Amino acid sequence: GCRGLKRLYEAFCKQDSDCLAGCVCPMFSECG
Amino acid sequence: SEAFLLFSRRADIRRISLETNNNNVAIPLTGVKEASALDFDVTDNRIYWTDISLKTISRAFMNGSALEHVVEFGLDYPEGMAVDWLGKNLYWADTGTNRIEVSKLDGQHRQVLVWKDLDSPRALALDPAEGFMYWTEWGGKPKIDRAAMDGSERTTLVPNVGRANGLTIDYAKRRLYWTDLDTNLIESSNMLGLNREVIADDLPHPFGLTQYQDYIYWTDWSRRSIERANKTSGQNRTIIQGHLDYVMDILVFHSSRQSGWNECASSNGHCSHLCLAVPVGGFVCGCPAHYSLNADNRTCSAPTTFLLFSQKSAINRMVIDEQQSPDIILPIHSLRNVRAIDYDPLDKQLYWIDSRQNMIRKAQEDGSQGFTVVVSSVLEIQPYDLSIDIYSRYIYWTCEATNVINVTRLDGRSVGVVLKGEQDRPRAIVVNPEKGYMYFTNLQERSPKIERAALDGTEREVLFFSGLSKPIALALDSRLGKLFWADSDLRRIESSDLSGANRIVLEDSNILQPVGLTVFENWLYWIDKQQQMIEKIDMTGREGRTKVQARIAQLSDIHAVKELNLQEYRQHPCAQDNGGCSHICLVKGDGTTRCSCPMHLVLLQDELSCGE
Numbered sequence: 337g338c339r340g341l342k343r344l345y346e347a348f349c350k351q352d353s354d355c356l357a358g359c360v361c362p363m364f365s366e367c368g
Numbered sequence: 369s370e371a372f373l374l375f376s377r378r379a380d381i382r383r384i385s386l387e388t389n390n391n392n393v394a395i396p397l398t399g400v401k402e403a404s405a406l407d408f409d410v411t412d413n414r415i416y417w418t419d420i421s422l423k424t425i426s427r428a429f430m431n432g433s434a435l436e437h438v439v440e441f442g443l444d445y446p447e448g449m450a451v452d453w454l455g456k457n458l459y460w461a462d463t464g465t466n467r468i469e470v471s472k473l474d475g476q477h478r479q480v481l482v483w484k485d486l487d488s489p490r491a492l493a494l495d496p497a498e499g500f501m502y503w504t505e506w507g508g509k510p511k512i513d514r515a516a517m518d519g520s521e522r523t524t525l526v527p528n529v530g531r532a533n534g535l536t537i538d539y540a541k542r543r544l545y546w547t548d549l550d551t552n553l554i555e556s557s558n559m560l561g562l563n564r565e566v567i568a569d570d571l572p573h574p575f576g577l578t579q580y581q582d583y584i585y586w587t588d589w590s591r592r593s594i595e596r597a598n599k600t601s602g603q604n605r606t607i608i609q610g611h612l613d614y615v616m617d618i619l620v621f622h623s624s625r626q627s628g629w630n631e632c633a634s635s636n637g638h639c640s641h642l643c644l645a646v647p648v649g650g651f652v653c654g655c656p657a658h659y660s661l662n663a664d665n666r667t668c669s670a671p672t673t674f675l676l677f678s679q680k681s682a683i684n685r686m687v688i689d690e691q692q693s694p695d696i697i698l699p700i701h702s703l704r705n706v707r708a709i710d711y712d713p714l715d716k717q718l719y720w721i722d723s724r725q726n727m728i729r730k731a732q733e734d735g736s737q738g739f740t741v742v743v744s745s746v747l748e749i750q751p752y753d754l755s756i757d758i759y760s761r762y763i764y765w766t767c768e769a770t771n772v773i774n775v776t777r778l779d780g781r782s783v784g785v786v787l788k789g790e791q792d793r794p795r796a797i798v799v800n801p802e803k804g805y806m807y808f809t810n811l812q813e814r815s816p817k818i819e820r821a822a823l824d825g826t827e828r829e830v831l832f833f834s835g836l837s838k839p840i841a842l843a844l845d846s847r848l849g850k851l852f853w854a855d856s857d858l859r860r861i862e863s864s865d866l867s868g869a870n871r872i873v874l875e876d877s878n879i880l881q882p883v884g885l886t887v888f889e890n891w892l893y894w895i896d897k898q899q900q901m902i903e904k905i906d907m908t909g910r911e912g913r914t915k916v917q918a919r920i921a922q923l924s925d926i927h928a929v930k931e932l933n934l935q936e937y938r939q940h941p942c943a944q945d946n947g948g949c950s951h952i953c954l955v956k957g958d959g960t961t962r963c964s965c966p967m968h969l970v971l972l973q974d975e976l977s978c979g980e
């Protein structure tokens with residue numbers, strides 16, 4: 337299960353170089 | 369005694385021996401899907417954790433035995449949790465439901481402490497020897513707040529901070545530590561939130577934190593590690609174990625983390641349900657959700673009158689009071705699908721229709737005493753609505769599949785069918801035993817009707833046939849002499865006397881899909897499925913229409929419960945011995961019992977019994 341980690345990922349993902357304030361942010365791939 | 373570090377990661381909980389060589393061994397648990405928040409009970413050698421994927425809080429001994437799920441209902445994102453080892457209380461913060469709750473460590477006497485003006489609490493720390501608890505709030509303007517451990521005198525300790533995690537108390541040195549997940553540093557302050565200092569500022573992604581002796585321990589998601597440093601200067605850094613990504617929480621297990629004394633440690637403060645620390649090292653008695661503290665400030669009274677509301681897979685209880693106390697979800701196992709609800713105020717038993725298994729069930733509000741009143745063998749039945757004759761001890765229910773009104777005793781024995789017709793489509797139903805009548809919607813093809821009949825199916829009459837599209841819900845008040853219905857197509861709620869006179873439209877605007885109605889005191893409550901709302905109107909006309917609760921999904925029924933006056937109840941002629949009637953006791957005319965029979969039986973010569 338990744339419900340907790342997914343919620344934390346989407347809460348801090350925009351704090352990443354890729355995000356130039358025009359990001360929905362990449363899909364969560366770290367389940368597992 | 370030896371000091372151990374416990375960390376959660378994915379679906380495992382692992383223990384690292386600090387005083388020996390670093391030796392990684394997993395806690396032999398089973399059935400964990402995502403272990404997040406950790407604590408322990410030094411007395412019982414018991415570990416406690418929340419599971420965000422199962423929305424549960426569980427506990428077990430360090431050896432895996434006595435696996436117990438102590439909270440399993442009404443959690444969304446329980447990412448904060450702490451053990452009150454003096455009072456033997458379990459505390460938790462739910463970031464999803466915006467609630468800080470408490471119960472006994474075994475789960476009993478669940479209560480909500482903080483719910484108003486609360487936005488996403490996450491990290492929780494307890495100081496039961498002082499009476500204070502501390503927590504971090506994420507949503508909105510992030511802050512670190514403090515309250516008494518009964519929830520009272522809430523205050524904001526640190527208002528200028530980013531989202532924080534790892535709230536940890538250094539009890540020996542009277543200092544608070546946390547990681548800031550937005551400014552990416554580790555800082556500390558005294559217990560008033562003052563004398564702030566940044567402990568370590570060069571860390572890429574500091575997430576978890578704990579404290580022990582002269583050290584702090586943190587985990588960094590970018591460094592993928594558990595590390596230790598000087599708790600005051602941040603230097604003297606070492607790596608405890610690396611190559612660990614997404615460590616959800618870390619915690620030091622040692623007797624020195626759980627010390628001190630308060631008045632709850634002895635005989636639970638002589639509190640009947642909950643002993644709750646408050647400043648300064650004192651306590652107050654607490655009660656389960658919706659209970660009242662008695663005059664002695666020691667015992668608790670269950671709520672006498674309340675509102676029950678149902679969704680697809682939950683049934684909830686709310687009360688009206690001066691605390692604006694939150695609704696709670698009743699911990700009813702064996703509840704899968706609810707479509708309709710009713711309550712027996714004599715035996716305090718809640719009844720519901722389960723449309724997945726096509727049954728009528730009953731249970732206590734604590735989940736126990738589960739029983740199946742109506743069931744189909746594995747032709748086919750399909751209960752649609754139900755209404756309880758509390759005096760005759762009968763359930764009147766509608767079956768969509770067979771289009772009959774059937775009657776069953778609360779022990780499951782069939783009484784019989786009182787309505788069957790070729791054209792009949794009885795759906796909604798409410799019984800008025802005080803006057804010998806039942807009221808039901810007849811969703812006949814092209815002609816939806818509101819009808820009344822005697823409780824034995826005779827004296828059938830159509831009350832209303834015009835102005836109806838989908839009359840989908842009924843309620844009545846025998847005291848005021850009114851009948852109520854909601855039409856889910858015409859998007860309105862109407863009322864009329866039980867005789868079918870004085871029909872008026874009470875509310876016809878700002879409604880999308882009214883699916884249920886109930887009467888509570890002088891108010892009429894209803895539920896709007898599409899708008900996800902509970903609303904009410906003052907039937908005296910004094911106060912305007914009022915919103916009660918919003919954003920409630922999958923609403924199905926609403927049902928008010930009044931404290932049943934036993935002296936008045938025993939005066940109903942069918943209450944004692946069913947008036948001597950074998951099957952149907954109905955009040956007629958000059959308040960006397962007349963016996964009647966279902967449609968498959970005929971009254972016998974004794975005029976008390978039913979035969980073929």
Ligand SMILES: *[C@@H]1O[C@H](CO)[C@@H](O[C@@H]2O[C@H](CO)[C@@H](O[C@@H]3O[C@H](CO)[C@@H](O)[C@H](O)[C@@H]3O)[C@H](O)[C@H]2NC(C)=O)[C@H](O)[C@H]1NC(C)=O
Nearest residue numbers: 741742743747767770772774775776780781782783784785
């Ligand atoms: C009105 O409600 C009752 C349930 O409260 C309906 O079901 C009747 O329930 C009895 C058990 O209470 C069923 O009896 C079982 O049927 C098998 C097969 O025939 C038979 O060997 C035994 O009698 C067994 O216990 C019974 O099937 C069922 N009624 C019938 C005659 O099928 C009752 O049917 C409801 N009335 C209607 C018309 O919906």
Ligand SMILES: *[C@@H]1O[C@H](CO[C@@H]2O[C@@H](C)[C@@H](O)[C@@H](O)[C@@H]2O)[C@@H](O[C@@H]2O[C@H](CO)[C@@H](O)[C@H](O)[C@H]2NC(C)=O)[C@H](O)[C@H]1NC(C)=O
Nearest residue numbers: 396409410411412413414415428429430431432433434435
């Ligand atoms: C697992 O531990 C439990 C509880 O004991 C706790 O942990 C122990 C290691 C010790 O630190 C105790 O002080 C703690 O309270 C065991 O519980 C009892 O253990 C004895 C011996 O096995 C057993 O005979 C009793 O029936 C147990 N009583 C209870 C409360 O269940 C439990 O047995 C331990 N399991 C194993 C694998 O030994």
Ligand SMILES: *[C@@H]1O[C@H](CO)[C@@H](O[C@@H]2O[C@H](CO)[C@@H](O)[C@H](O)[C@H]2NC(C)=O)[C@H](O)[C@H]1NC(C)=O
Nearest residue numbers: 638651652653654660661662663664665666667
């Ligand atoms: C139970 O708690 C109540 C509330 O504190 C106490 O009742 C009074 O409360 C006032 C404040 O509103 C106190 O200043 C008084 O001392 C209390 N008066 C009394 C004696 O009733 C009450 O004392 C508490 N104790 C019990 C056992 O009832």
Ligand SMILES: *[C@@H]1O[C@H](CO[C@@H]2O[C@H](CO)[C@@H](O)[C@H](O)[C@H]2NC(C)=O)[C@@H](O)[C@H](O)[C@H]1NC(C)=O
Nearest residue numbers: 581582583584597598599600601602603604605
């Ligand atoms: C952690 O660092 C402390 C620091 O102790 C003193 O702290 C004061 C105030 O910060 C400072 O002015 C002194 O110079 C410090 N003295 C020393 C000896 O550094 C150490 O005392 C601890 O031993 C350190 N922890 C460990 C385990 O090294």
Ligand SMILES: *[C@@H]1O[C@H](CO)[C@@H](O)[C@H](O)[C@H]1NC(C)=O
Nearest residue numbers: 582597598601602603604605
């Ligand atoms: C770091 O810890 C070591 C051993 O405890 C010791 O040198 C001292 O306490 C700390 N170092 C400094 C520079 O203070």
Ligand SMILES: [Ca+2]
Nearest residue numbers: 463464488507
């Ligand atoms: Ca929230």
Ligand SMILES: [Ca+2]
Nearest residue numbers: 577578618619
């Ligand atoms: Ca921690």
Ligand SMILES: [Ca+2]
Nearest residue numbers: 754755797798
């Ligand atoms: Ca009903």
Ligand SMILES: [Ca+2]
Nearest residue numbers: 885886926927
């Ligand atoms: Ca209802």
